Amino acid sequence: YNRMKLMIVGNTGSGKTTLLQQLMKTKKSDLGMQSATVGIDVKDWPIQIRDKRKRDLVLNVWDFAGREEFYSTHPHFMTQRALYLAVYDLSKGQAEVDAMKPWLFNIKARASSSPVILVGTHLDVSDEAQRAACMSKITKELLNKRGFPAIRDYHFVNATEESDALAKLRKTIINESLNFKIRDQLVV
Amino acid sequence: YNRMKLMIVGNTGSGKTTLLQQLMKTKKSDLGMQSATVGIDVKDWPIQIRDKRKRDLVLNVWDFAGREEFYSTHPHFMTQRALYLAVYDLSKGQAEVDAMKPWLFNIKARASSSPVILVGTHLDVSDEAQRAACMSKITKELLNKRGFPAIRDYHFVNATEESDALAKLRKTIINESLNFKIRDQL
Numbered sequence A: 001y002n003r004m005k006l007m008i009v010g011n012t013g014s015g016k017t018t019l020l021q022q023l024m025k026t027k028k029s030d031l032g033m034q035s036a037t038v039g040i041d042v043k044d045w046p047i048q049i050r051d052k053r054k055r056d057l058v059l060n061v062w063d064f065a066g067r068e069e070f071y072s073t074h075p076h077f078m079t080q081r082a083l084y085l086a087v088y089d090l091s092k093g094q095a096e097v098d099a100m101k102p103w104l105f106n107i108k109a110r111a112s113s114s115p116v117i118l119v120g121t122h123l124d125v126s127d128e129a130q131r132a133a134c135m136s137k138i139t140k141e142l143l144n145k146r147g148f149p150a151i152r153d154y155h156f157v158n159a160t161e162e163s164d165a166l167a168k169l170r171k172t173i174i175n176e177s178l179n180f181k182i183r184d185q186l187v188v
Numbered sequence B: 001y002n003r004m005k006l007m008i009v010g011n012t013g014s015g016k017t018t019l020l021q022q023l024m025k026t027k028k029s030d031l032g033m034q035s036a037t038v039g040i041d042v043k044d045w046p047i048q049i050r051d052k053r054k055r056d057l058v059l060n061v062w063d064f065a066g067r068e069e070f071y072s073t074h075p076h077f078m079t080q081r082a083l084y085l086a087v088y089d090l091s092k093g094q095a096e097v098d099a100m101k102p103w104l105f106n107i108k109a110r111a112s113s114s115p116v117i118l119v120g121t122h123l124d125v126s127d128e129a130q131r132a133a134c135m136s137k138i139t140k141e142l143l144n145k146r147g148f149p150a151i152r153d154y155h156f157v158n159a160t161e162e163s164d165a166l167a168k169l170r171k172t173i174i175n176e177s178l179n180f181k182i183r184d185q186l
């Protein structure tokens, strides 16, 4: 309701769900502490409707646990306190870094104060030419750009297993989450 | 997905998840989800810090499938393209109709034009006097109130099984979705 959100964005199949699964992985990973029920469940309900016409209608259903969860979707909270993971497939080449640009424009517009951590997944199945092209494109075309979010860090990981690289990303998500929350309290 | 959102709201344990499960269990038609993955997945990530005396909260993690799913959470869609299902437990009596008032004020604050369908669950374990007291309270204090959403319909159901009552609610939800881009009152 009040606490900070982590927004994981990128194109479908980039490895967002896989990455989160590994980031949360311990003994107590996904299901742990507090609620006996999911706070917000979002599912499509396709209905072969018949009111006047015989058309097809899909409703995007938001199932809220209670007041705290509904309050958390206030336009203020969605747009404000949020650290963004911008995720892309390293193995599909530097064209995927170009594909992050429209995402960064969309994040800046939606959440003007929100920092971004760039995560390149599929490190294990990328060649060093792809990694070199992606690295150079990030440093020259994405980092410290007026109209883009502040990119606090950028990582290249295999999102399917625990590694030193993933453990560092996890540490960075923690540190950048704590920092952002109370960071830049005033403006001169 | 498609444009219109159905927002199921009320207090924890009122039967929201049970009600939606029964609404979506329609005859014998098999289909599941549109795509291979959940469009928007929201889960709490409890994290523990090495520096103590600063026990942080959980991270509220929003996992978006792609562009269309992110686009769908633009405040314009979340506030102006939302139909509401306001759920309460009838077996807890008229106090739960009172507890809908703060919900209706919060829903009005999101958008003036927000339509609401009221649903009392637990009809199967509710006294006739409980139903009577709740029906009178709705019609007196909730229907056609300036400052509340337009209550297009109110329902009493056993949310755990199929019924003519639940079938009627299903058709109210469909009708209100198809009728959404129409004005309320004169």
Ligand SMILES: Nc1nc2c(ncn2[C@@H]2O[C@H](COP(=O)(O)OP(=O)(O)O)[C@@H](O)[C@H]2O)c(=O)[nH]1
Pocket: A010, A011, A012, A013, A014, A015, A016, A017, A018, A019, A121, A122, A123, A124, A125, A157, A158, A159, A160, B037, B065
């Ligand atoms: N080899 C490899 N496969 C990955 C990696 N990250 C994701 N994948 C695979 O990419 C596919 C899509 O992953 P998913 O998490 O569903 O992507 P999402 O659509 O962005 O949520 C799955 O087959 C994953 O196992 C990675 O770092 N290495």
Ligand SMILES: Nc1nc2c(ncn2[C@@H]2O[C@H](COP(=O)(O)OP(=O)(O)O)[C@@H](O)[C@H]2O)c(=O)[nH]1
Pocket: A037, A065, B011, B012, B013, B014, B015, B016, B017, B018, B019, B121, B122, B123, B124, B125, B157, B158, B159, B160
């Ligand atoms: N007997 C009966 N039980 C119900 C009804 N609706 C919900 N329940 C039960 O109420 C409890 C809470 O339901 P749930 O859907 O999890 O509530 P939520 O917290 O509002 O999502 C569960 O034990 C359900 O089986 C109903 O109409 N009749």
Ligand SMILES: [Mg+2]
Pocket: A016, A017, A018, B037, B038, B063, B064, B065
């Ligand atoms: Mg996914």
Ligand SMILES: [Mg+2]
Pocket: A007, A077, A078, A079, A080, A081, A082, A110, A111, A114
């Ligand atoms: Mg945001």
Ligand SMILES: [Mg+2]
Pocket: A037, A063, A064, A065, B016, B017, B018
């Ligand atoms: Mg529930």
Ligand SMILES: [Mg+2]
Pocket: B007, B078, B079, B082, B110
């Ligand atoms: Mg809303």
